Ligand binder design. Structure first.
Ligand code: NA
Ligand code: ZN
Ligand code: ZN
Ligand code: ZN
Ligand code: ZN
Length: 305
């Protein structure tokens, strides 16, 4: 069976994400890059490869709002997201719908848009059991209390239409559980989002983010459910040299704690973190072998187990 067939209607159980029979499950896969730039990398061929060859459990659909994203054509971007959600579902993948805020870093800047978009997505896809909603990719420059209040504004819009879906909430300091802004996950545990079936996002880039980030992820996983919706093996820019030794420490921790992840990213961007070599997408593949950057071969090998 496909991942979706094997785990069914995933839900939070205690501090973990579980399958529909209460067994903790670790969903591993890939994040797209921004669909405003790398839409051409998401085709029948490339998505079939991700599902059937790479054996990904899950795909995160990253939709930037600024940076030539959603705000430039809400209707067109929404229609493409519907199409991609259906395509992922027709390949047996879980899907994270990623409201990819970054700059501006205050999620409230995009709240009115987020309510409109998520209302449409949740209504259309309410009958699906494989869709998770990521309501604010990388909050930055804002307090945890303000992220919590943002979450409490958006969550009811989704839950009104799709009550039984998992929502992933971004965290302080580019979703570093506060680590990058001098804090940590204890702040969240002391003042959690007042909803259940919630997970909290953590992002890391292994060449830049060492033991203090790894420790924070371990710490958080004791207190609440974490999903690593974005990570890289290189520096925090998504480029530079890989540190696979450090990355493997994160991978081993996530496997031990059944923390799901989606690696940045499934595109042929020039940066080392994009799994394909520039030109691969225009060439229609191949989606393996000589078209993979080092980080690409590394993650494909992890996913194939
Ligand atoms: Na980025
Ligand atoms: Zn196909
Ligand atoms: Zn541009
Ligand atoms: Zn539902
Ligand atoms: Zn990011």
């Amino acid at each position: 069976g496909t991942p979706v067939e094997r785990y069914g209607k995933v839900q939070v159980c205690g501090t973990q994400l579980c399958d529909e029979h209460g067994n903790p499950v670790q969903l591993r896969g890939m994040s797209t890059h921004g669909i405003q730039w790398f839409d051409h990398c998401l085709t029948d061929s490339s998505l079939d490869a991700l599902a059937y060859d790479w054996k990904a459990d899950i795909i995160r659909l990253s939709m930037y709002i600024q940076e030539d994203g959603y705000e430039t054509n809400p209707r067109g971007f929404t229609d493409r997201m519907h199409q991609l959600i259906d395509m992922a579902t027709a390949r047996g993948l879980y899907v994270i719908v990623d409201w990819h805020i970054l700059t501006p870093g205050d999620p409230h800047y995009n709240l009115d848009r987020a309510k409109t978009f998520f209302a449409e997505i949740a209504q259309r896809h309410a009958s699906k059991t494989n869709v998770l909603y990521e309501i604010a990719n990388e909050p930055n420059g804002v307090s945890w209390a303000s992220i919590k209040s943002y979450a409490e504004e958006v969550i009811p819009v989704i839950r009104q239409r799709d009550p039984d879906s998992v929502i992933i909430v971004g965290t302080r300091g580019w979703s570093s559980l506060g680590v990058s802004e001098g804090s940590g996950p204890a702040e969240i545990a002391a003042n959690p989002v007042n909803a259940s079936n919630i997970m909290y996002a953590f992002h890391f880039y292994a060449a830049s983010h060492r033991d203090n980030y790894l420790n924070a992820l371990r710490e958080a996983s004791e207190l609440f459910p974490v999903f690593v919706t974005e990570f890289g093996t290189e520096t925090y820019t998504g480029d530079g040299a890989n540190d696979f030794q450090m990355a493997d420490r994160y991978i081993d921790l996530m496997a031990e704690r059944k923390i799901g992840w989606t690696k940045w990213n499934y595109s042929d961007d020039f940066r080392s973190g994009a799994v394909f070599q520039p030109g691969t997408c225009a060439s229609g593949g191949p989606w393996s072998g000589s078209s993979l950057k080092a980080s690409g071969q590394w993650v494909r090998s992890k996913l194939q187990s």
